[PDB]
């Protein structure tokens, strides 16, 4: 069961959980109410498991795409911000957190992937995906590689897969010919030894932050570990594919309140009056950047950072994630397809056909 008279918060391990804890400390220093921030592994799969029987945190943070499935299973409290609180955020951000016409979470920030590059190895980053093989050959001759990014999570490969362009994957529309073209290009990068099928988030981060690879693909949360690393880096528009922009699926980091929480009023106070303020968001943001924040007063400041202008540019070229209850199934089918194609276990056509079936 959930303890009454305290707050338990789950947020992903890549996000600013220490900064959020500091917002917990301000909460407690002035209400007496203790806030515990946790970042469990696979939190987005645990939450629906534990919440279904009335367990779990009082507040969960994730991109909005999983929140629909949670709202459909009755796991999220309808939130009750008054009309004046709602006017503190950009009006469109509320749509990412509406499900069946009801508000089921607070939007925090728009996150989009960008190309991040080492300006000392690569003063002029490539404009196209297609030219990456030739660039990699050049850099390999000096003991470096062109590009490493997480190939294990389909979020990172989607921008390429989605770039070009019944064939739905779990009720998400996909351009069949375009997804084949993107994913074949990615399989060919691997066959030709420009990337490794086993690269994951840590490997790609350590290679970039150690100056071993010229480029990575990541979100705003990644920038503070690069700052620490002293790599002279830039954040820029993703490369084009077949002359078309890469199209990332864009998530809105959002905060939902557990429907089984006995602390709904406290969670609401914490969220509206401590986190969603300049001071609150600035605390989380200095730990790991949030992206383009939903709070008009604070986004107004951040938006002059060229890294954020890059984040915004890539967002304009991509597509907000659907939040249909099928999204969890959708991501798993894509993930399986990319991994099986990239390892050579299946052809592209077989992997995509399997994802499109049932």
């Amino acid at each position, epitope marked *: 069961k959930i303890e009454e008279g305290k707050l338990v918060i789950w947020i992903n391990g890549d996000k600013g959980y220490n900064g959020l804890a500091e917002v917990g400390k301000k909460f407690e220093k002035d209400t007496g109410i203790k806030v515990t921030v946790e970042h469990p592994d696979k939190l987005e799969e645990k939450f629906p498991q534990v919440a279904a029987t009335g367990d779990g945190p009082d507040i969960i943070f994730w991109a909005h795409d999983r929140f629909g499935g949670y709202a459909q299973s009755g796991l999220l409290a309808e939130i009750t911000p008054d009309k004046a609180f709602q006017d503190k955020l950009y009006p469109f951000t*509320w749509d*990412a957190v509406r499900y069946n016409g009801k508000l089921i979470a607070y939007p925090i920030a*728009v996150e989009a992937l960008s190309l991040i590059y080492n300006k000392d190895l690569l003063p002029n980053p490539p404009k196209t995906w297609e030219e990456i093989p030739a660039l990699d050959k050049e850099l390999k001759a000096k003991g470096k590689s062109a590009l490493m990014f997480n190939l294990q999570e389909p979020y990172f490969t989607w921008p390429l897969i989605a770039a070009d362009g019944k064939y739905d994957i779990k009720d998400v529309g996909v351009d069949n010919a375009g997804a084949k073209a993107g994913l074949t290009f990615l399989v060919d990068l691997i066959k030709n030894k420009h990337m490794n099928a086993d690269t994951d988030y840590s490997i790609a981060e350590a290679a970039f932050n150690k100056g071993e690879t010229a480029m990575t693909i990541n979100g705003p949360w990644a920038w503070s570990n690069i700052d620490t690393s002293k790599v002279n880096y830039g954040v820029t528009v993703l490369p084009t594919f077949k002359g078309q922009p890469s199209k990332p699926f864009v998530g809105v980091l959002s905060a939902g309140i557990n429907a089984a929480s006995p602390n709904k009023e406290l969670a609401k106070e914490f969220l509206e009056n401590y986190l969603l303020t300049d001071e609150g968001l600035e605390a989380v943001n200095k730990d790991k950047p949030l992206g383009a924040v939903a709070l008009k007063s604070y*986004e*107004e400041e951040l938006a002059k950072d060229p890294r954020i202008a890059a984040t*915004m540019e890539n967002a304009q070229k991509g597509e907000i994630m659907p939040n249909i209850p099928q999204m969890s199934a959708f991501w798993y089918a894509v993930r399986t397809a990319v991994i099986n194609a990239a390892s050579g276990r299946q052809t592209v056509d077989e992997a995509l056909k399997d994802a499109q079936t049932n």
Partner: antibody
Amino acid sequence: VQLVESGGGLVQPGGSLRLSCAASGFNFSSSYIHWVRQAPGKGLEWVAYISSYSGYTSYADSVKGRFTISADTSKNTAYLQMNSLRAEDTAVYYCARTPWWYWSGLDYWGQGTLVTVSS
Amino acid sequence: DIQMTQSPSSLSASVGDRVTITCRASQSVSSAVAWYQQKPGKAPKLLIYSASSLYSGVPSRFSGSRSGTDFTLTISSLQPEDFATYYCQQSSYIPVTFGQGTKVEIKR
């Protein structure tokens, strides 16, 4: 890329009209459709918008309770049902769109359709 | 509802002149302000979004800037084809609101 309005024309006062805006060449399911109107010799007046994503709708005070905005994502078409029409509603009506992202402008606009309300 | 006030409501300027149209928001909107040009008989066309982003394809003589709550549309070198009504628009709040328009004519 296009937004094509239809359904305007002469209507009696107190009467009704349904305006259509048929879209193509952009992601309709994540766009917002807006109706913006312009009375003879006056400026632009935003009247209504709908989120394709969430179905959320909202209205200018001047039309609330008489106009209904809707959208059928499966035919990429949005609608403005105009009831209890008044002389004050005479205008060229434009449909326009914004994409999902909150920092955009109204990038795509229809050609406009003239609504005249008189006997 | 947010009122957007443009100054001046009308101006006359020579070809090659630099033209400035200003828009003052009734309360504080955030850089969420777009500028449009409307020829008479025709749909408005977006010029600038997010206060200072030049919409794709628009000639680089058009630029937008912000100073606090004052939004500025600048035409660095006015062309005979630029006569129109220009409108600012805010999208920080719903209802979306438009300025009243500034009519630009060419002085000759």
